[PDB]
Copies of this chain bind each other. A is one copy, B any other.
């Protein structure tokens, strides 16, 4: 699960509290198991900062596309 205490997002910033499911995630079943526990105390973002509190599911790189492409 995910848990956050204090998140500050100003100056055209944006924050998302959840998981990201891309249109590539079409393979999965129902299985109840253990899930990693990720939690943050304080996050201060300034200047179009983007806060992602959760896990990301993608195939084309990651959350954003700035560096490290396909080999």
Asked if A68 contacts B68 (CB within 8 A), the reply is no
Number of identical protomers: 5
Interface size range on A against B: 35 or more
Given contacts A15-B45, A45-B10, contact A24 B59 (CB under 8 A): yes
CB-based contact A67/B59 at 8 Å: no
CB pair B66 A48 closer than 8 Å: yes
Residues of B within 8 A of A52 (CB): 14-18
Per-position binary interface string of chain A over residues 13-49, scored 1 when its CB falls under 8 Å from any chain B CB and 0 otherwise: 1111111111111111111111111111111111111
- B-chain residues with CB within 8 Å of residue A40 when the two chains form the complex: 3-5, 7, 15, 17, 53
Interface residues, chain A, with chain B CB atoms under 8 Å away = 1-71
